Amino acid sequence: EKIWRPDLVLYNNADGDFAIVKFTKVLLQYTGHITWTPPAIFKSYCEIIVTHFPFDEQNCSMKLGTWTYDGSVVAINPESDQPDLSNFMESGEWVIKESRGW
Amino acid sequence: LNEEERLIRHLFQEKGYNKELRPVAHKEESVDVALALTLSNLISLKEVEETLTTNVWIEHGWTDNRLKWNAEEFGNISVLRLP
Amino acid sequence: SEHETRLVAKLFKDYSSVVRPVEDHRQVVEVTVGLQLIQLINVDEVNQIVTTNVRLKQQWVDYNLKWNPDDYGGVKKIHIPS
Amino acid sequence: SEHETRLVAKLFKDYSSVVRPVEDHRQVVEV
Amino acid sequence: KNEELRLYHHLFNNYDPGSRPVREPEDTVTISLKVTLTNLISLNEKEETLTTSVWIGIDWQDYRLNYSKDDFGGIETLRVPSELVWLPEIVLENNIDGQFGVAYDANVLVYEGGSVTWLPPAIYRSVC
Ligand SMILES: *[C@@H]1O[C@H](CO)[C@@H](O[C@@H]2O[C@H](CO)[C@@H](O)[C@H](O)[C@H]2NC(C)=O)[C@H](O)[C@H]1NC(C)=O
Ligand SMILES: *[C@H]1O[C@H](CO)[C@@H](O)[C@H](O)[C@H]1NC(C)=O
Ligand SMILES: CC(=O)OCC[N+](C)(C)C
């Protein structure tokens, strides 16, 4: 809470929080590098195509961006081409066939 | 309320009241706290959740000897309402 | 409004929100209370609860929050956090 | 930690969380 | 030496967010209003409640926050937290759940010439 942070907001928030509300600590190196890894519950809006239900495939998106800073003052870059699923808990109802960040 | 303002200033600013410390002369002493409960209304008892919802008023009484004053010296004030 | 800034600084220099706002502690604070019912949200017959949306208008005089408008550029009213 | 206490006091003596954290305003914060 | 810091100190060293931005008490502040609907979440008919996601754009002039880019290295926009500036305090009056304000308190953008813009997002549950 004491430092400047980027104001990332979930554009397609449906009925949750738009921004980060759980302000966990940042790790600061002597070089000024900051790593901040807050948690969040994203309640995003997804168009659910029910045509093949219960054999249906869905494509749920999460659009994230700095709300009040444009690209000329703050630039966001993906850490990797894909979301990190290393700690993902297995779902008893869904299988993630694909995942990608653009 | 010149008198209530003066009394509050005397009790808290002048004497240096510290709300973090208990009202005791020595640490080994204990503070007597008397409790009573008034049931305003029994809202519900949910069986599936096994939960009782009640509206209660909790009457607390204790003594804080740091908050003592002689009323005649402060316009015969006998009681104060404080946050 | 520089006048309002100076006014608010003066009004809350030695102000106490704990103390009742009249000149003598033997005097009573006179409060006018009015209720505005905006909506009757729901009647719960099981738990016997009526939920309503209301506005609770409260009017009273604060003795220590007076000023002369001429000394503050004609400012006759201000908005203050409750 | 006395060293970390002193460092934390020093870092936030004249710190501002309002402006973007760049030496020059024409630089872009890379996130 | 970041010029944003100098501009911020110039604009906010002596500034009262409690007072309206009017030179005289009898002047009026004009607020240019825009409401952008991004999604109609639902209409719950049992509770008679419309849930919508919007952005409330409000623009106005604050003469106290007036600055020229030439005096501050060409800065044309400064982002500051909305709590540091006066706001008109726009609320949804016909809300049903008691939530009057916006969902996320975004920064205001202060443009040269004293032009303040605020575009927070909001989830509103309104009576219908
Ligand atoms: C912000 O300041 C500038 C001046 O730097 C104001 O522009 C002036 O507008 C007036 C007429 O009202 C002219 O006579 C001037 O020539 C302009 N500038 C100068 C330097 O004289 C501008 O109006 C201000 N914005 C406000 C008041 O919000
Ligand atoms: C308290 O002091 C006042 C002023 O001396 C006196 O008139 C009054 O009788 C005293 N006692 C009470 C109970 O008011
Ligand atoms: C400047 C500002 O607050 O803009 C918010 C809207 N957005 C994220 C689409 C640009």
Swiss-Prot record, chain A:
Subcellular location: Postsynaptic cell membrane; Cell membrane
One GO cellular component, as annotated: acetylcholine-gated channel complex
Domain of life of the organism encoding this protein: Eukaryota
Tissues where this protein is expressed: Isoform 1 is only expressed in skeletal muscle. Isoform 2 is constitutively expressed in skeletal muscle, brain, heart, kidney, liver, lung and thymus.
Effect of V50L: In CMS1B; mutant channel shows an approximately 30-fold decrease of ACh binding affinity for the second of 2 closed-state binding sites but only a 2-fold decrease in gating efficiency
Glycosylation sites: N59
Primary location group: membrane
Keyword terms: Cell membrane, Congenital myasthenic syndrome, Disease variant, Disulfide bond, Glycoprotein, Ion channel, Ion transport, Ligand-gated ion channel, Membrane, Postsynaptic cell membrane, Receptor, Signal, Synapse, Transmembrane, Transmembrane helix, Transport
Disulfide bridge positions per record: C46-C60
GO molecular function terms noted in the UniProt entry: acetylcholine binding; acetylcholine receptor activity; acetylcholine-gated monoatomic cation-selective channel activity; transmitter-gated monoatomic ion channel activity involved in regulation of postsynaptic membrane potential
GO biological process: acetylcholine receptor signaling pathway; membrane depolarization; monoatomic ion transmembrane transport; muscle cell cellular homeostasis; musculoskeletal movement; neuromuscular junction development; neuromuscular process; neuromuscular synaptic transmission
Similarity annotation: Belongs to the ligand-gated ion channel (TC 1.A.9) family. Acetylcholine receptor (TC 1.A.9.1) subfamily. Alpha-1/CHRNA1 sub-subfamily.
This protein's name: Acetylcholine receptor subunit alpha
Organism of origin: Homo sapiens (Human)
Phylogenetic lineage: Eukaryota, Metazoa, Chordata, Craniata, Vertebrata
Included range, full protein: 103 to 204 of 457
From Swiss-Prot, chain B:
Tree of life domain: Eukaryota
Name the record gives this protein: Acetylcholine receptor subunit delta
Family, as annotated: Belongs to the ligand-gated ion channel (TC 1.A.9) family. Acetylcholine receptor (TC 1.A.9.1) subfamily. Delta/CHRND sub-subfamily.
Oligomeric form and interacting partners: Pentamer of two alpha chains, and one each of the beta, delta, and gamma (in immature muscle) or epsilon (in mature muscle) chains. The muscle heteropentamer composed of alpha-1, beta-1, delta, epsilon subunits interacts with the alpha-conotoxin ImII.
Compartments reported by the entry: Postsynaptic cell membrane; Cell membrane
Glycosylation-annotated residues: N76
Functional description taken from the UniProt entry: After binding acetylcholine, the AChR responds by an extensive change in conformation that affects all subunits and leads to opening of an ion-conducting channel across the plasma membrane.
Impact reported for L21P: In CMS3B; results in reduced gating efficiency; slows opening of the channel; decreases probability that the channel will open in response to ACh
Species, as recorded: Homo sapiens (Human)
From Swiss-Prot, chain E:
Consequence recorded when altering L78P: In CMS4A; rare example of recessive inheritance
Domain of life according to the entry: Eukaryota
Subcellular location: Postsynaptic cell membrane; Cell membrane
Glycosylation sites: N66
Disease tied to this protein: The muscle AChR is the major target antigen in the autoimmune disease myasthenia gravis. Myasthenia gravis is characterized by sporadic muscular fatigability and weakness, occurring chiefly in muscles innervated by cranial nerves, and characteristically improved by cholinesterase-inhibiting drugs. Myasthenic syndrome, congenital, 4A, slow-channel: A form of congenital myasthenic syndrome, a group of disorders characterized by failure of neuromuscular transmission, including pre-synaptic, synaptic, and post-synaptic disorders that are not of autoimmune origin. Clinical features are easy fatigability and muscle weakness affecting the axial and limb muscles (with hypotonia in early-onset forms), the ocular muscles (leading to ptosis and ophthalmoplegia), and the facial and bulbar musculature (affecting sucking and swallowing, and leading to dysphonia).
Family affiliation: Belongs to the ligand-gated ion channel (TC 1.A.9) family. Acetylcholine receptor (TC 1.A.9.1) subfamily. Epsilon/CHRNE sub-subfamily.
Function (record text): After binding acetylcholine, the AChR responds by an extensive change in conformation that affects all subunits and leads to opening of an ion-conducting channel across the plasma membrane.
Subunit structure: Pentamer of two alpha chains, and one each of the beta, delta, and gamma (in immature muscle) or epsilon (in mature muscle) chains. The muscle heteropentamer composed of alpha-1, beta-1, delta, epsilon subunits interacts with the alpha-conotoxin ImII.
Identification of the protein by name: Acetylcholine receptor subunit epsilon
Gene designation: CHRNE
Full protein: residues contained: 21 to 148 of 493
